[PDB]
A = this chain, B = another copy of it.
Amino acid sequence: IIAYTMSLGAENSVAYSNNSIAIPTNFTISVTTEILPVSMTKTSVDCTMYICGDSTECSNLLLQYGSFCTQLKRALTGIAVEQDKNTQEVFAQVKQIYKTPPIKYFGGFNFSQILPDPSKPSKRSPIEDLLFNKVTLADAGFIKQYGDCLGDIAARDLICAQKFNGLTVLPPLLTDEMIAQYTSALLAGTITSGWTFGAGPALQIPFPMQMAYRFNGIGVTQNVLYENQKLIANQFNSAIGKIQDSLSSTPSALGKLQDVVNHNAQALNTLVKQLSSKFGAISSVLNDILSRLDPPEAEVQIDRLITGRLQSLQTYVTQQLIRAAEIRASANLAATKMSECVLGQSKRVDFCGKGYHLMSFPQSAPHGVVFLHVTYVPAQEKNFTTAPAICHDGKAHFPREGVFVSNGTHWFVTQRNFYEPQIITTDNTFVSGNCDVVIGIVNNTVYD
């Protein structure tokens, strides 16, 4: 063991200067996996089953509370309907279920890793298959045969013990297949039409032209895409494959959803174990008190046990409500991320992945969602000399949509997020003002 002071990352020093400007000459399409929880386990409880233990003598004494138990039941039902609404609002954003057409060459892009594969049930993609295989649910809320809890309880089938006390998990409204259908529809819409199927009717347009408009939305002109279309397609495919391999080998990919389900299961398990705890009484079973102690004090003891277990249920409900508020914030964030990155091109930084966002793709994760953020990122930059203006004839020429540069004895104009020198022309440079107000203006010609 060795202790040390944490490092804040590798040091760096930008070679700043009054006439130094760096511009990219190449770039790279990166993909990042952003996971967000969208729902949690639904629950429903019987007060008497949890507390009394199927005893009529304790029931009416538990009915002396009445409202207390019902408040919790209503809160749990509210949490459940809220999880359902969260799923609906995160996935069911479009009412038209688009179908993917027979895949034709998309200018180079291969979506086979995120499209639904008909070679297996559930009509989902390989990445979604991996995501489903990563997360394991203690109780999905599905149908369980009566023979399940009838023997061979050596496994971690605590669900039997949790159901013996009213605690039972329900199945979500929208099955995994419906979420997969919504995801496939969104993917087909974004790859066939672009940002139009979110505002209204689906307007078809080639995926190359879609990506060209994406690029135009972050400075890089359409030519940067058309003249490097094959390289960009190869980069996209390689990044998709690398993300697949990472999510496959990296066990901590879906750690957030795993921790969500683990927290829910652990809360249920501890709430169950609380039953075996002596809440100041002589025994954990009310029948023992009824058979050993007299009614005068047995009633007080039963009231004590009931208050203790009701407080346990209240603590559980409060923790679940706080976690549900968290997951609701996460679901709203996921819906916003969908609407922005998936259904459009977002300008917000660090919201649709690291770097300039081009487009995103959703994947149906268990109790959550995984966004594959496609971004545009420069690389292998180079240094050039800059000049805020160009003086040609007693007037200053300023850039229209780019920046000036100089490779030495010659001067050119180019854009910011990419290197594409062009001669200083009158169309490229607007003229306004003399050459005496500018501080770093340089004398150079403006072609006509």
Contact = CB atoms under 8 A, between A and B. Distances in A.
Contacts of A307: 279-280, 308
Interface of A is mostly: mixed
Contact of A371 (B36, B261, B320, B324): B36
Interface stretch (A51-59, A91-99, A120-128, A163-171): A91-99
B23 A97 contact: no
Interface in A22-61: 22-41, 43, 45, 47, 50
Interface in A364-386: 365, 367-386
Contact of A28 (B369, B377, B417): B377
Identical chains in the assembly: 4
A379 B26 contact: yes
A242 interface: no
Contacts of A277: 64-68
B313 A314 contact: no
Contact of A24 (B209, B308, B418): B418
A100 to B, nearest CB: 8
A378 B315 contact: no
B204 A38 contact: no
Contact of A313 (B13, B47, B199, B356): B47
Contacts of A95: 9-10
A193 B32 contact: no
A339 B351 contact: yes
Given A12-B202, A45-B313, A325-B322, A21 B97 contact: no
A448 interface: no
Given A26-B380, A222-B388, A347-B347, 8 more contacts: A9-B94, A14-B98, A14-B202, A17-B204, A20-B386, A39-B367, A198-B354, A209-B386
